[PDB]
Ligand binder design. Structure first.
Ligand SMILES: Cc1sc(-c2ccncc2)c(C2=CCC(C)(C)CC2)c1[C@H](OC(C)(C)C)C(=O)O
Ligand SMILES: Cc1sc(-c2ccncc2)c(C2=CCC(C)(C)CC2)c1[C@H](OC(C)(C)C)C(=O)O
Ligand SMILES: [Mg+2]
Ligand SMILES: [Mg+2]
Ligand SMILES: [Mg+2]
Ligand SMILES: [Mg+2]
Ligand SMILES: [Mg+2]
Ligand SMILES: [Mg+2]
Ligand SMILES: [Mg+2]
Ligand SMILES: [Mg+2]
Lengths: 131, 131
């Protein structure tokens, strides 16, 4: 179903990568964040909801969505309540970039553009059909 | 035409807002960035290209795309070479948030979801049709 996303944090090189997966397509977004924090999750969610129609969000760590600030973001935006593959692509490009955050965006790009239709094409097709 | 984006920086409250417009739909993305810099433009471009099919990018300040690091990002991603409306929406929500960056994402959300089909619906329809 087209408005369902999955959100989780992973660790790499002593930093935090917030990864969101659009479950029906496999499309991803990701950001290196300074801390695993309510404020960062909330700000991420706000940015995601403005780009895509985010109806419902699932996670593998329910306590992630417990903060008042996360709930306030989901309230405002109308939201209700791959780590291994991405790390693989990160590992392949890591040496091409200085910053981990740059490697992550390179891996996100590679992941979404790859013919597995790419995940980037599938999300758009899924969402459009749904309108 | 569906792969064409417009990119520019504006100023508000002594900070820099990078704004990208998907020209065919009016859909926007935006980020408050610490400095008007080649590195920030390049990193933004990398994040945008991974989410949407960005073929060509236009700007109102050509010297923005002059840095070696911007060119390297456009090279890697295969890219070739509203400020008033957004500021208006920012002004309407500003008092609801502490951080300007949060107000900007709220304004982006409002702008893309508004029935003017919303710009968020139009980009997806435009891009899907094109596949
Ligand atoms: C801090 C730098 S300098 C630089 C660069 C400069 C000149 N020519 C190639 C790469 C780069 C790039 C590396 C790979 C790329 C495909 C994202 C393009 C730009 C970066 C890059 O950080 C950015 C994206 C500028 C914040 C990095 O983490 O290495
Ligand atoms: C630093 C804070 S605390 C906080 C908040 C906390 C509790 N209840 C409502 C709002 C908020 C929120 C304000 C508006 C919102 C719709 C984005 C939801 C969360 C923020 C917010 O910064 C964030 C998004 C957490 C980095 C802000 O700039 O004011
Ligand atoms: Mg969705
Ligand atoms: Mg998690
Ligand atoms: Mg957006
Ligand atoms: Mg990143
Ligand atoms: Mg496009
Ligand atoms: Mg400009
Ligand atoms: Mg993406
Ligand atoms: Mg912002």
């Amino acid at each position: 179903s087209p408005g369902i996303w999955q959100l989780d944090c992973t660790h790499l090189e002593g930093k935090v990568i917030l990864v969101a997966v659009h479950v029906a397509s496999g499309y991803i977004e990701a950001e290196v964040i300074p801390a695993e924090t309510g404020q960062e999750t909330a700000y991420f969610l706000l940015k995601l909801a403005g780009r895509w129609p985010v109806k419902t969000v699932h996670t593998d760590n329910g306590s992630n969505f417990t903060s008042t600030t996360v709930k306030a973001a989901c309230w405002w935006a109308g939201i209700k309540q791959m780590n291994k593959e991405l790390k693989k692509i990160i590992g392949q490009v890591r040496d091409q970039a200085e910053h981990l955050k740059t490697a992550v965006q390179m891996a996100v790009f590679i992941h979404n553009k790859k013919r597995k239709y790419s995940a980037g094409e599938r999300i758009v097709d899924i969402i459009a059909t749904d309108i």
